[PDB]
Amino acid sequence: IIALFIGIMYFLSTRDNVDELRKIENKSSFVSADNMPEYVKGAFISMEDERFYNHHTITQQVVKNYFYKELFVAHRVEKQYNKNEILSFYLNNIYFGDNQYTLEGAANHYFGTTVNKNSTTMSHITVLQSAILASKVNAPSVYNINNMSENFTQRVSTNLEKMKQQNYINETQYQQAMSQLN
Known part of the structure:
Protein backbone atom coordinates (compact mmCIF):
# COMPACT_ATOMS: atom_id res chain seq x y z
CA ILE A 1 0.00 0.00 0.00
CA ILE A 2 3.05 2.40 0.52
CA ALA A 3 4.02 1.40 -3.04
CA LEU A 4 0.35 1.92 -4.06
CA PHE A 5 0.22 5.32 -2.31
CA ILE A 6 3.44 6.43 -4.07
CA GLY A 7 1.90 5.70 -7.51
CA ILE A 8 -1.57 7.16 -7.09
CA MET A 9 0.14 10.35 -5.83
CA TYR A 10 2.23 10.25 -8.94
CA PHE A 11 -0.85 10.03 -11.27
CA LEU A 12 -2.29 13.13 -9.51
CA SER A 13 1.10 14.75 -9.97
CA THR A 14 0.93 14.47 -13.80
CA ARG A 15 -2.44 16.48 -13.98
CA ASP A 16 -0.15 19.43 -13.41
CA ASN A 17 1.81 20.06 -16.63
CA VAL A 18 5.12 21.72 -16.05
CA ASP A 19 5.05 23.53 -19.48
CA GLU A 20 2.52 25.89 -17.85
CA LEU A 21 5.27 27.55 -15.75
CA ARG A 22 6.30 29.13 -19.02
CA LYS A 23 3.30 31.55 -18.74
CA ILE A 24 5.00 33.47 -15.87
CA GLU A 25 7.11 35.06 -18.63
CA ASN A 26 4.01 36.62 -20.23
CA LYS A 27 3.45 38.98 -17.19
CA SER A 28 3.99 42.68 -17.75
CA SER A 29 6.51 43.28 -14.84
CA PHE A 30 8.48 40.02 -15.47
CA VAL A 31 12.24 40.18 -15.33
CA SER A 32 14.47 37.10 -15.84
CA ALA A 33 17.27 36.13 -13.50
CA ASP A 34 19.73 36.55 -16.43
CA ASN A 35 19.05 40.31 -16.17
CA MET A 36 19.28 40.57 -12.35
CA PRO A 37 22.46 41.69 -10.57
CA GLU A 38 24.42 38.90 -8.86
CA TYR A 39 23.55 39.99 -5.43
CA VAL A 40 19.84 40.11 -5.91
CA LYS A 41 19.75 36.46 -6.90
CA GLY A 42 22.07 35.99 -3.84
CA ALA A 43 19.61 37.53 -1.42
CA PHE A 44 17.18 34.76 -2.52
CA ILE A 45 19.37 31.77 -2.86
CA SER A 46 21.34 32.33 0.35
CA MET A 47 18.17 32.59 2.46
CA GLU A 48 16.03 29.70 1.01
CA ASP A 49 18.16 27.32 -0.96
CA GLU A 50 21.93 27.73 -0.42
CA ARG A 51 22.73 25.02 -2.92
CA PHE A 52 20.16 25.89 -5.62
CA TYR A 53 22.68 25.55 -8.49
CA ASN A 54 23.96 22.02 -7.52
CA HIS A 55 20.79 20.21 -6.36
CA HIS A 56 18.17 18.58 -8.70
CA THR A 57 13.72 24.64 -1.56
CA ILE A 58 13.35 26.87 -4.66
CA THR A 59 12.23 24.31 -7.22
CA GLN A 60 9.63 22.97 -4.80
CA GLN A 61 8.67 26.49 -3.79
CA VAL A 62 8.09 27.32 -7.51
CA VAL A 63 5.73 24.33 -7.81
CA LYS A 64 3.76 24.95 -4.57
CA ASN A 65 3.13 28.64 -5.56
CA TYR A 66 2.02 28.19 -9.17
CA PHE A 67 -0.21 25.11 -8.78
CA TYR A 68 -1.06 24.87 -5.03
CA LYS A 69 3.40 15.07 -4.63
CA GLU A 70 5.03 18.47 -5.04
CA LEU A 71 8.28 16.44 -5.18
CA PHE A 72 7.15 14.70 -8.32
CA VAL A 73 6.26 17.94 -10.02
CA ALA A 74 9.65 19.23 -8.73
CA HIS A 75 11.66 16.44 -10.34
CA ARG A 76 10.07 17.37 -13.67
CA VAL A 77 10.64 21.09 -13.53
CA GLU A 78 14.36 20.10 -13.18
CA LYS A 79 14.39 17.86 -16.26
CA GLN A 80 12.68 20.60 -18.40
CA TYR A 81 14.29 23.83 -17.15
CA ASN A 82 17.77 25.28 -16.68
CA LYS A 83 18.47 26.79 -13.23
CA ASN A 84 18.14 30.41 -14.31
CA GLU A 85 14.74 29.68 -15.83
CA ILE A 86 13.55 27.99 -12.55
CA LEU A 87 14.94 30.87 -10.56
CA SER A 88 12.98 33.41 -12.71
CA PHE A 89 9.71 31.53 -12.16
CA TYR A 90 10.42 31.73 -8.38
CA LEU A 91 11.16 35.37 -8.31
CA ASN A 92 8.21 36.39 -10.57
CA ASN A 93 5.52 34.45 -8.69
CA ILE A 94 5.61 35.02 -4.87
CA TYR A 95 4.08 37.14 -2.27
CA PHE A 96 6.11 40.25 -1.30
CA GLY A 97 3.15 42.06 0.34
CA ASP A 98 0.74 44.72 -0.76
CA ASN A 99 -0.45 42.63 -3.73
CA GLN A 100 2.92 42.17 -5.41
CA TYR A 101 3.67 38.89 -6.85
CA THR A 102 6.73 39.88 -8.95
CA LEU A 103 10.17 40.95 -7.69
CA GLU A 104 10.12 44.01 -9.95
CA ALA A 139 8.49 35.58 6.52
CA PRO A 140 5.52 35.56 8.94
CA SER A 141 2.53 37.46 7.52
CA VAL A 142 2.76 40.42 10.04
CA TYR A 143 6.24 41.12 8.77
CA ASN A 144 5.77 44.42 6.92
CA ILE A 145 8.26 46.23 4.51
CA ASN A 146 6.32 49.51 4.91
CA ASN A 147 7.04 49.33 8.68
CA MET A 148 9.64 46.75 9.65
CA SER A 149 9.57 45.42 13.15
CA GLU A 150 12.68 44.46 15.07
CA ASN A 151 11.76 40.78 14.44
CA PHE A 152 11.79 41.51 10.72
CA THR A 153 15.06 43.50 10.97
CA GLN A 154 16.58 40.51 12.64
CA ARG A 155 15.51 38.34 9.72
CA VAL A 156 17.08 40.77 7.27
CA SER A 157 20.28 40.97 9.40
CA THR A 158 20.46 37.24 9.00
CA ASN A 159 19.72 37.38 5.21
CA LEU A 160 22.62 39.85 4.92
CA GLU A 161 25.04 37.69 7.06
CA LYS A 162 24.22 34.78 4.77
CA MET A 163 24.86 36.86 1.55
CA LYS A 164 28.30 37.79 2.92
CA GLN A 165 29.07 34.21 4.07
CA GLN A 166 28.18 32.72 0.64
CA ASN A 167 30.19 35.54 -1.10
CA TYR A 168 27.43 37.31 -3.06
CA ILE A 169 28.49 40.66 -1.42
CA ASN A 170 31.64 42.07 0.26
CA GLU A 171 32.47 43.70 3.70
CA THR A 172 31.81 47.25 2.40
CA GLN A 173 28.59 46.22 0.73
CA TYR A 174 27.55 44.46 3.98
CA GLN A 175 28.38 47.14 6.57
CA GLN A 176 26.79 49.59 4.23
CA ALA A 177 23.56 47.46 4.35
CA MET A 178 23.79 46.97 8.16
CA SER A 179 24.19 50.67 8.57
CA GLN A 180 21.10 51.64 6.40
CA LEU A 181 19.25 48.78 8.30
CA ASN A 182 20.12 50.41 11.79
Missing part, protein backbone atom coordinates in the same frame (compact mmCIF):
# COMPACT_ATOMS: atom_id res chain seq x y z
CA GLY A 105 6.59 45.02 -8.98
CA ALA A 106 7.64 44.68 -5.34
CA ALA A 107 10.85 46.69 -5.79
CA ASN A 108 9.18 49.42 -7.85
CA HIS A 109 6.41 49.58 -5.22
CA TYR A 110 8.25 49.75 -1.87
CA PHE A 111 11.39 51.41 -3.06
CA GLY A 112 11.18 53.08 -6.49
CA THR A 113 14.06 50.82 -7.58
CA THR A 114 14.60 48.20 -10.25
CA VAL A 115 15.93 44.72 -10.29
CA ASN A 116 17.02 44.86 -13.90
CA LYS A 117 20.72 45.61 -14.26
CA ASN A 118 20.34 46.74 -17.83
CA SER A 119 18.02 49.66 -16.84
CA THR A 120 19.25 53.27 -17.23
CA THR A 121 15.79 54.75 -16.55
CA MET A 122 15.28 53.88 -12.94
CA SER A 123 17.54 53.64 -9.87
CA HIS A 124 19.00 50.16 -9.11
CA ILE A 125 17.96 48.01 -6.20
CA THR A 126 20.33 48.24 -3.22
CA VAL A 127 21.75 45.18 -1.38
CA LEU A 128 19.69 46.11 1.65
CA GLN A 129 16.47 46.26 -0.38
CA SER A 130 17.34 42.92 -1.92
CA ALA A 131 17.77 41.35 1.49
CA ILE A 132 14.46 42.87 2.57
CA LEU A 133 12.45 41.46 -0.37
CA ALA A 134 14.29 38.09 0.07
CA SER A 135 13.60 37.93 3.86
CA LYS A 136 9.82 38.51 3.28
CA VAL A 137 8.85 35.70 0.93
CA ASN A 138 8.72 33.03 3.64
Whole structure:
Protein backbone atom coordinates (compact mmCIF):
# COMPACT_ATOMS: atom_id res chain seq x y z
CA ILE A 1 0.00 0.00 0.00
CA ILE A 2 3.05 2.40 0.52
CA ALA A 3 4.02 1.40 -3.04
CA LEU A 4 0.35 1.92 -4.06
CA PHE A 5 0.22 5.32 -2.31
CA ILE A 6 3.44 6.43 -4.07
CA GLY A 7 1.90 5.70 -7.51
CA ILE A 8 -1.57 7.16 -7.09
CA MET A 9 0.14 10.35 -5.83
CA TYR A 10 2.23 10.25 -8.94
CA PHE A 11 -0.85 10.03 -11.27
CA LEU A 12 -2.29 13.13 -9.51
CA SER A 13 1.10 14.75 -9.97
CA THR A 14 0.93 14.47 -13.80
CA ARG A 15 -2.44 16.48 -13.98
CA ASP A 16 -0.15 19.43 -13.41
CA ASN A 17 1.81 20.06 -16.63
CA VAL A 18 5.12 21.72 -16.05
CA ASP A 19 5.05 23.53 -19.48
CA GLU A 20 2.52 25.89 -17.85
CA LEU A 21 5.27 27.55 -15.75
CA ARG A 22 6.30 29.13 -19.02
CA LYS A 23 3.30 31.55 -18.74
CA ILE A 24 5.00 33.47 -15.87
CA GLU A 25 7.11 35.06 -18.63
CA ASN A 26 4.01 36.62 -20.23
CA LYS A 27 3.45 38.98 -17.19
CA SER A 28 3.99 42.68 -17.75
CA SER A 29 6.51 43.28 -14.84
CA PHE A 30 8.48 40.02 -15.47
CA VAL A 31 12.24 40.18 -15.33
CA SER A 32 14.47 37.10 -15.84
CA ALA A 33 17.27 36.13 -13.50
CA ASP A 34 19.73 36.55 -16.43
CA ASN A 35 19.05 40.31 -16.17
CA MET A 36 19.28 40.57 -12.35
CA PRO A 37 22.46 41.69 -10.57
CA GLU A 38 24.42 38.90 -8.86
CA TYR A 39 23.55 39.99 -5.43
CA VAL A 40 19.84 40.11 -5.91
CA LYS A 41 19.75 36.46 -6.90
CA GLY A 42 22.07 35.99 -3.84
CA ALA A 43 19.61 37.53 -1.42
CA PHE A 44 17.18 34.76 -2.52
CA ILE A 45 19.37 31.77 -2.86
CA SER A 46 21.34 32.33 0.35
CA MET A 47 18.17 32.59 2.46
CA GLU A 48 16.03 29.70 1.01
CA ASP A 49 18.16 27.32 -0.96
CA GLU A 50 21.93 27.73 -0.42
CA ARG A 51 22.73 25.02 -2.92
CA PHE A 52 20.16 25.89 -5.62
CA TYR A 53 22.68 25.55 -8.49
CA ASN A 54 23.96 22.02 -7.52
CA HIS A 55 20.79 20.21 -6.36
CA HIS A 56 18.17 18.58 -8.70
CA THR A 57 13.72 24.64 -1.56
CA ILE A 58 13.35 26.87 -4.66
CA THR A 59 12.23 24.31 -7.22
CA GLN A 60 9.63 22.97 -4.80
CA GLN A 61 8.67 26.49 -3.79
CA VAL A 62 8.09 27.32 -7.51
CA VAL A 63 5.73 24.33 -7.81
CA LYS A 64 3.76 24.95 -4.57
CA ASN A 65 3.13 28.64 -5.56
CA TYR A 66 2.02 28.19 -9.17
CA PHE A 67 -0.21 25.11 -8.78
CA TYR A 68 -1.06 24.87 -5.03
CA LYS A 69 3.40 15.07 -4.63
CA GLU A 70 5.03 18.47 -5.04
CA LEU A 71 8.28 16.44 -5.18
CA PHE A 72 7.15 14.70 -8.32
CA VAL A 73 6.26 17.94 -10.02
CA ALA A 74 9.65 19.23 -8.73
CA HIS A 75 11.66 16.44 -10.34
CA ARG A 76 10.07 17.37 -13.67
CA VAL A 77 10.64 21.09 -13.53
CA GLU A 78 14.36 20.10 -13.18
CA LYS A 79 14.39 17.86 -16.26
CA GLN A 80 12.68 20.60 -18.40
CA TYR A 81 14.29 23.83 -17.15
CA ASN A 82 17.77 25.28 -16.68
CA LYS A 83 18.47 26.79 -13.23
CA ASN A 84 18.14 30.41 -14.31
CA GLU A 85 14.74 29.68 -15.83
CA ILE A 86 13.55 27.99 -12.55
CA LEU A 87 14.94 30.87 -10.56
CA SER A 88 12.98 33.41 -12.71
CA PHE A 89 9.71 31.53 -12.16
CA TYR A 90 10.42 31.73 -8.38
CA LEU A 91 11.16 35.37 -8.31
CA ASN A 92 8.21 36.39 -10.57
CA ASN A 93 5.52 34.45 -8.69
CA ILE A 94 5.61 35.02 -4.87
CA TYR A 95 4.08 37.14 -2.27
CA PHE A 96 6.11 40.25 -1.30
CA GLY A 97 3.15 42.06 0.34
CA ASP A 98 0.74 44.72 -0.76
CA ASN A 99 -0.45 42.63 -3.73
CA GLN A 100 2.92 42.17 -5.41
CA TYR A 101 3.67 38.89 -6.85
CA THR A 102 6.73 39.88 -8.95
CA LEU A 103 10.17 40.95 -7.69
CA GLU A 104 10.12 44.01 -9.95
CA GLY A 105 6.59 45.02 -8.98
CA ALA A 106 7.64 44.68 -5.34
CA ALA A 107 10.85 46.69 -5.79
CA ASN A 108 9.18 49.42 -7.85
CA HIS A 109 6.41 49.58 -5.22
CA TYR A 110 8.25 49.75 -1.87
CA PHE A 111 11.39 51.41 -3.06
CA GLY A 112 11.18 53.08 -6.49
CA THR A 113 14.06 50.82 -7.58
CA THR A 114 14.60 48.20 -10.25
CA VAL A 115 15.93 44.72 -10.29
CA ASN A 116 17.02 44.86 -13.90
CA LYS A 117 20.72 45.61 -14.26
CA ASN A 118 20.34 46.74 -17.83
CA SER A 119 18.02 49.66 -16.84
CA THR A 120 19.25 53.27 -17.23
CA THR A 121 15.79 54.75 -16.55
CA MET A 122 15.28 53.88 -12.94
CA SER A 123 17.54 53.64 -9.87
CA HIS A 124 19.00 50.16 -9.11
CA ILE A 125 17.96 48.01 -6.20
CA THR A 126 20.33 48.24 -3.22
CA VAL A 127 21.75 45.18 -1.38
CA LEU A 128 19.69 46.11 1.65
CA GLN A 129 16.47 46.26 -0.38
CA SER A 130 17.34 42.92 -1.92
CA ALA A 131 17.77 41.35 1.49
CA ILE A 132 14.46 42.87 2.57
CA LEU A 133 12.45 41.46 -0.37
CA ALA A 134 14.29 38.09 0.07
CA SER A 135 13.60 37.93 3.86
CA LYS A 136 9.82 38.51 3.28
CA VAL A 137 8.85 35.70 0.93
CA ASN A 138 8.72 33.03 3.64
CA ALA A 139 8.49 35.58 6.52
CA PRO A 140 5.52 35.56 8.94
CA SER A 141 2.53 37.46 7.52
CA VAL A 142 2.76 40.42 10.04
CA TYR A 143 6.24 41.12 8.77
CA ASN A 144 5.77 44.42 6.92
CA ILE A 145 8.26 46.23 4.51
CA ASN A 146 6.32 49.51 4.91
CA ASN A 147 7.04 49.33 8.68
CA MET A 148 9.64 46.75 9.65
CA SER A 149 9.57 45.42 13.15
CA GLU A 150 12.68 44.46 15.07
CA ASN A 151 11.76 40.78 14.44
CA PHE A 152 11.79 41.51 10.72
CA THR A 153 15.06 43.50 10.97
CA GLN A 154 16.58 40.51 12.64
CA ARG A 155 15.51 38.34 9.72
CA VAL A 156 17.08 40.77 7.27
CA SER A 157 20.28 40.97 9.40
CA THR A 158 20.46 37.24 9.00
CA ASN A 159 19.72 37.38 5.21
CA LEU A 160 22.62 39.85 4.92
CA GLU A 161 25.04 37.69 7.06
CA LYS A 162 24.22 34.78 4.77
CA MET A 163 24.86 36.86 1.55
CA LYS A 164 28.30 37.79 2.92
CA GLN A 165 29.07 34.21 4.07
CA GLN A 166 28.18 32.72 0.64
CA ASN A 167 30.19 35.54 -1.10
CA TYR A 168 27.43 37.31 -3.06
CA ILE A 169 28.49 40.66 -1.42
CA ASN A 170 31.64 42.07 0.26
CA GLU A 171 32.47 43.70 3.70
CA THR A 172 31.81 47.25 2.40
CA GLN A 173 28.59 46.22 0.73
CA TYR A 174 27.55 44.46 3.98
CA GLN A 175 28.38 47.14 6.57
CA GLN A 176 26.79 49.59 4.23
CA ALA A 177 23.56 47.46 4.35
CA MET A 178 23.79 46.97 8.16
CA SER A 179 24.19 50.67 8.57
CA GLN A 180 21.10 51.64 6.40
CA LEU A 181 19.25 48.78 8.30
CA ASN A 182 20.12 50.41 11.79
